[PDB]
Design an enzyme around this catalytic site. Structure first.
Site, PDB file in Angstrom:
ATOM      1  N   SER A 155       0.811  -1.213   0.000  1.00  0.00           N
ATOM      2  CA  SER A 155       0.000   0.000   0.000  1.00  0.00           C
ATOM      3  C   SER A 155       0.851   1.273   0.000  1.00  0.00           C
ATOM      4  O   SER A 155       0.318   2.368  -0.129  1.00  0.00           O
ATOM      5  CB  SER A 155      -0.980   0.011   1.175  1.00  0.00           C
ATOM      6  OG  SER A 155      -0.287   0.182   2.392  1.00  0.00           O
TER       7      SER A 155
ATOM      8  N   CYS B  50       0.230   1.163  10.987  1.00  0.00           N
ATOM      9  CA  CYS B  50       0.673  -0.230  10.998  1.00  0.00           C
ATOM     10  C   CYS B  50       0.395  -0.974   9.678  1.00  0.00           C
ATOM     11  O   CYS B  50      -0.741  -0.994   9.201  1.00  0.00           O
ATOM     12  CB  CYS B  50       0.005  -0.965  12.168  1.00  0.00           C
ATOM     13  SG  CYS B  50       0.315  -2.735  12.233  1.00  0.00           S
ATOM     14  N   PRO B  51       1.417  -1.626   9.102  1.00  0.00           N
ATOM     15  CA  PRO B  51       2.808  -1.775   9.553  1.00  0.00           C
ATOM     16  C   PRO B  51       3.801  -0.760   8.987  1.00  0.00           C
ATOM     17  O   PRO B  51       4.975  -0.855   9.336  1.00  0.00           O
ATOM     18  CB  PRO B  51       3.181  -3.168   9.039  1.00  0.00           C
ATOM     19  CG  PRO B  51       2.421  -3.279   7.775  1.00  0.00           C
ATOM     20  CD  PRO B  51       1.102  -2.565   8.013  1.00  0.00           C
ATOM     21  N   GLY B  52       3.367   0.155   8.121  1.00  0.00           N
ATOM     22  CA  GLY B  52       4.220   1.264   7.730  1.00  0.00           C
ATOM     23  C   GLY B  52       4.507   1.548   6.270  1.00  0.00           C
ATOM     24  O   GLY B  52       5.573   2.088   5.943  1.00  0.00           O
ATOM     25  N   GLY B  53       3.567   1.214   5.394  1.00  0.00           N
ATOM     26  CA  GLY B  53       3.737   1.473   3.975  1.00  0.00           C
ATOM     27  C   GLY B  53       3.730   2.961   3.680  1.00  0.00           C
ATOM     28  O   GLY B  53       4.587   3.462   2.967  1.00  0.00           O
TER      29      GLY B  53
ATOM     30  N   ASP C 108      -0.767   4.056  15.650  1.00  0.00           N
ATOM     31  CA  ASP C 108      -1.495   2.807  15.538  1.00  0.00           C
ATOM     32  C   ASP C 108      -1.334   1.971  16.795  1.00  0.00           C
ATOM     33  O   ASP C 108      -0.351   2.112  17.518  1.00  0.00           O
ATOM     34  CB  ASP C 108      -0.975   2.013  14.343  1.00  0.00           C
ATOM     35  CG  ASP C 108      -2.039   1.159  13.718  1.00  0.00           C
ATOM     36  OD1 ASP C 108      -2.699   0.393  14.453  1.00  0.00           O
ATOM     37  OD2 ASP C 108      -2.211   1.257  12.489  1.00  0.00           O
TER      38      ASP C 108
ATOM     39  N   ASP D 195      -5.260   5.286  18.875  1.00  0.00           N
ATOM     40  CA  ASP D 195      -6.323   5.193  17.890  1.00  0.00           C
ATOM     41  C   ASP D 195      -6.289   6.467  17.047  1.00  0.00           C
ATOM     42  O   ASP D 195      -6.534   7.560  17.557  1.00  0.00           O
ATOM     43  CB  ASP D 195      -7.655   5.084  18.646  1.00  0.00           C
ATOM     44  CG  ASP D 195      -8.842   4.781  17.749  1.00  0.00           C
ATOM     45  OD1 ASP D 195      -9.024   5.448  16.705  1.00  0.00           O
ATOM     46  OD2 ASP D 195      -9.615   3.874  18.112  1.00  0.00           O
TER      47      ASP D 195
ATOM     48  N   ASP E 147      -4.887   6.382   6.109  1.00  0.00           N
ATOM     49  CA  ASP E 147      -5.369   5.282   5.292  1.00  0.00           C
ATOM     50  C   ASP E 147      -6.065   4.319   6.236  1.00  0.00           C
ATOM     51  O   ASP E 147      -5.735   3.137   6.294  1.00  0.00           O
ATOM     52  CB  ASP E 147      -4.194   4.595   4.598  1.00  0.00           C
ATOM     53  CG  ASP E 147      -4.629   3.535   3.607  1.00  0.00           C
ATOM     54  OD1 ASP E 147      -5.590   3.780   2.853  1.00  0.00           O
ATOM     55  OD2 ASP E 147      -4.010   2.453   3.580  1.00  0.00           O
TER      56      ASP E 147
ATOM     57  N   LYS F 277     -13.255   5.179   1.305  1.00  0.00           N
ATOM     58  CA  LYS F 277     -13.848   4.004   0.681  1.00  0.00           C
ATOM     59  C   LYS F 277     -15.135   4.397  -0.029  1.00  0.00           C
ATOM     60  O   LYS F 277     -15.846   5.296   0.422  1.00  0.00           O
ATOM     61  CB  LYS F 277     -14.127   2.917   1.721  1.00  0.00           C
ATOM     62  CG  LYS F 277     -12.899   2.534   2.533  1.00  0.00           C
ATOM     63  CD  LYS F 277     -11.787   2.000   1.636  1.00  0.00           C
ATOM     64  CE  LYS F 277     -10.425   2.086   2.315  1.00  0.00           C
ATOM     65  NZ  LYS F 277      -9.918   3.492   2.366  1.00  0.00           N
TER      66      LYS F 277
HETATM   67  C1  LIG Z   1      -5.334  -1.055   5.771  1.00  0.00           C
HETATM   68  S1  LIG Z   1      -4.081  -0.677   7.027  1.00  0.00           S
HETATM   69  C2  LIG Z   1      -2.989   0.419   6.091  1.00  0.00           C
HETATM   70  C3  LIG Z   1      -1.793   0.870   6.917  1.00  0.00           C
HETATM   71  C4  LIG Z   1      -0.801   1.731   6.147  1.00  0.00           C
HETATM   72  N1  LIG Z   1      -1.460   2.542   5.120  1.00  0.00           N
HETATM   73  C5  LIG Z   1       0.295   0.844   5.566  1.00  0.00           C
HETATM   74  O1  LIG Z   1       0.575   0.877   4.357  1.00  0.00           O
HETATM   75  O2  LIG Z   1       0.921   0.083   6.312  1.00  0.00           O
HETATM   76  C6  LIG Z   1      -4.967   0.498   8.080  1.00  0.00           C
HETATM   77  C7  LIG Z   1      -4.443   0.549   9.513  1.00  0.00           C
HETATM   78  O3  LIG Z   1      -5.255   1.460  10.229  1.00  0.00           O
HETATM   79  C8  LIG Z   1      -5.511   0.939  11.519  1.00  0.00           C
HETATM   80  N2  LIG Z   1      -6.805   1.427  12.010  1.00  0.00           N
HETATM   81  C9  LIG Z   1      -8.050   1.279  11.443  1.00  0.00           C
HETATM   82  N3  LIG Z   1      -8.950   1.896  12.250  1.00  0.00           N
HETATM   83  C10 LIG Z   1      -8.288   2.427  13.316  1.00  0.00           C
HETATM   84  C11 LIG Z   1      -8.700   3.153  14.433  1.00  0.00           C
HETATM   85  N4  LIG Z   1      -9.991   3.446  14.611  1.00  0.00           N
HETATM   86  N5  LIG Z   1      -7.747   3.558  15.354  1.00  0.00           N
HETATM   87  C12 LIG Z   1      -6.404   3.254  15.182  1.00  0.00           C
HETATM   88  N6  LIG Z   1      -6.001   2.535  14.080  1.00  0.00           N
HETATM   89  C13 LIG Z   1      -6.933   2.135  13.169  1.00  0.00           C
HETATM   90  C14 LIG Z   1      -5.449  -0.580  11.424  1.00  0.00           C
HETATM   91  O4  LIG Z   1      -5.004  -1.179  12.632  1.00  0.00           O
HETATM   92  C15 LIG Z   1      -4.477  -0.780  10.277  1.00  0.00           C
HETATM   93  O5  LIG Z   1      -3.204  -1.044  10.826  1.00  0.00           O
END
Ligand SMILES: C[S@@+](CC[C@H](N)C(=O)[O-])C[C@H]1O[C@@H](n2cnc3c(N)ncnc32)[C@H](O)[C@@H]1O
Ligand SMILES: C[S@@+](CC[C@H](N)C(=O)[O-])C[C@H]1O[C@@H](n2cnc3c(N)ncnc32)[C@H](O)[C@@H]1O
Lengths: 357, 357
Positions: B188, B221-224, B240, B260, B277, B306
């Site tokens: 991502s 998470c994880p850091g893209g 995260d 969060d 994201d 989305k």
């Molecule tokens: C689809 S992942 C994309 C992460 C990032 N764009 C990457 O490339 O690594 C979305 C992240 O957002 C976090 N996330 C979703 N809703 C959240 C919330 N309400 N509070 C904190 N983190 C949240 C999830 O734990 C997930 O790690």
């Protein structure tokens, strides 16, 4: 770029300025034009920064009477050093025009710019090569790229800019280059000849100024206008109480009708061209021209209207609206252009093409 | 030319078509767009003959969400003979474009056009040389001339036309060319990277994506996304509850905040960039983004929304108008863009730059 330069006859800057302010105003392209008495040009300064390019795109060049040519320009370059003439001009055009089609280095049509003209025509050559290297001009001449203008208002002082080839004068300084032919009876032959160049697109000449057409020349004596028609291989009824040149009569193409152009009624039904250079009040000449067009006595016409002393732009526009009113009143479709030709002094030349369904 | 081609994600032709009809309609540039399910492009056919060039000049390309790229085209060339491939294409472009700046031979982004893509990329070379000889392309590449597009919808079937480099995608097929870096924690990463290419003009990168800036990555998470920020030499607060890649932590530029993203309040006052994201309802994400911008917690932001199942163009436009309403309500000046990136599926990416007086 907000500045548009219009070239005009020296001493007609006020008309040229009145007209462009009026016609640009009509399109909500506002600005002003200062008038430098006899400068031989006028600069319209738009209020909006990029309105200059809008103006020379959207307002039809053919609809201006008192401009010989126009182009958008940028800031005035002052004091061009003799030892470094190319760089500053290239710097002003780079990014402004890329791969332009043609270069024209012009001056105002005044006597004080006569020496400067000679400089400009020669400077064209080395300047064009340099503008090519810089990518401002294409390596080959092209109709479908803008014309690049470098305009000198004094030595070492010039503007730079452009115009669209589909909306400008195809001619240098807006003046077609014509030599006077010694066998033509009058110098006024160059008025009709110039008019042919100004009003009829060159690639339509063989079609619209066609070998074999009938024409009528009202006020033909001694035959300058008739001459241009004869040169196109037309058959001509020359109408005048004065005599036609024998040289014309010898061609076998001229029929001399000893009449009053204002009283003349064509018996013939298929006259393509009528031209008229009769000296008389503008409202009366216009009326005559409207008769010819409304009755379908000719398909196309070129004629002259003398200008009054004051309110020239207003007066001659009035005359034109008279003719247009007469056409509308009888449901007749026609295109009308008028231009103060180079060979016109205190007058304007008009061309009208009538259409049949 | 009345036809404008818009490249889009296959299966989003209806949105792409709804949008362009809506936004061209708003300018009284009327016409229609047929929809070929999954074709990967849409053709808007204007009613007025030359409205095509008007549309790709005046409607800002950056304001379309579902078009990757667009260009005006002419008539469909069918059955290009293998033995004569150059002439018919040159004949369609001559007089249409003179001294163009660049050539792009493109296809739709479908699987059925994968072989055709390979043909197009190679055909570019001999075709470009030929278009140069014909004067359709300048002999040197140029930013300030139109891009010439030859668009193949099937073998031997193509359109030809152009777009303005100051109002289009700078990228081939509207897709920036990105290799995935093996040391980045997630695929991502290419969404943010693509977004950087789509939204920030390349010559502003060192200024706007500057070495030394603070950034916040919500849902890191994880850091893209964090990775792309780190690659720009930024200092990042990665937010995260999930862990950040050790490779990122080792750089010394990443501070992991176990929180969060939706609850996170920045203590710091000079954050340049916030990116988000987070997977969640579009109206809620939008609300969060409006909080950040209205409070001046960041200067610029890139985030994802989305899409719903139906009314995608309507829904995502609603979300954007929400954020714009929040800005207006608090007197805040910002520029907003949204684009369905190549690496976006059932989502749209948004960029907002806030301004301070
Ligand atoms: C689809 S992942 C994309 C992460 C990032 N764009 C990457 O490339 O690594 C979305 C992240 O957002 C976090 N996330 C979703 N809703 C959240 C919330 N309400 N509070 C904190 N983190 C949240 C999830 O734990 C997930 O790690
Ligand atoms: C200025 S001269 C130009 C003639 C022509 N353009 C040429 O180059 O030879 C105008 C001519 O129109 C004629 N003219 C003026 N008014 C006229 C009238 N009312 N009836 C007939 N001829 C007239 C004059 O006799 C004169 O010969």
């Amino acid at each position: 770029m907000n500045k548009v330069v219009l070239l005009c006859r020296p001493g007609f800057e006020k008309e040229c300025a009145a007209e462009i302010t009026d016609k640009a105003g009509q399109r909500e392209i506002f600005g002003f034009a200062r008038v430098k008495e006899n400068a031989g040009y006028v600069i319209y300064e738009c209020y909006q920064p990029d309105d200059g390019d809008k103006l020379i795109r959207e307002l039809p060049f053919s609809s201006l009477i008192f401009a010989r040519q126009w182009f958008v320009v940028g800031e005035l370059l002052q004091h061009l050093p003799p030892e470094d003439r190319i760089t500053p001009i290239v710097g002003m055009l780079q990014g402004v025009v890329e791969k332009g089609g043609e270069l024209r280095v012009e001056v105002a049509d005044t006597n004080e710019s006569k020496e400067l003209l000679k400089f400009c025509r020669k400077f064209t050559v080395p300047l064009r090569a340099a503008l090519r290297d810089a990518g401002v001009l294409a390596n080959y001449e092209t109709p479908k790229r803008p014309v690049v203008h470098v305009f000198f208002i004094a030595p070492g002082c010039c503007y730079t800019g452009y115009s669209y080839s589909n909306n400008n004068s195809p001619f240098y300084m807006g003046i077609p280059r014509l030599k006077f032919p010694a066998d033509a009876p009058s110098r006024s032959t160059l008025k009709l000849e110039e008019a042919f160049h100004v009003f009829i697109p060159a690639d339509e000449w063989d079609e619209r100024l066609a070998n074999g057409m009938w024409a009528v020349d009202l006020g033909a004596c001694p035959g300058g206008w008739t001459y241009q028609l004869v040169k196109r291989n037309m058959w001509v009824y020359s109408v005048d109480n004065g005599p036609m040149a024998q040289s014309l009569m010898d061609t076998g193409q001229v029929t001399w009708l000893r009449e009053d152009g204002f009283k003349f009624r064509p018996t013939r039904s298929n006259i393509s061209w009528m031209v008229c250079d009769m000296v008389e009040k503008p409202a009366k000449v216009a009326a005559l021209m409207a008769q010819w067009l409304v009755n379908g006595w000719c398909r196309e016409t070129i004629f002259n209207l003398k200008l009054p002393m004051k309110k020239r732009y207003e007066e001659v526009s009035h005359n034109l609206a008279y003719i247009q009113a007469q056409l509308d009143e009888h449901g007749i479709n026609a295109q009308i252009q008028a231009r103060q030709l180079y060979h016109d002094r205190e007058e304007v030349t008009v061309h009208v093409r009538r259409i049949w369904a």
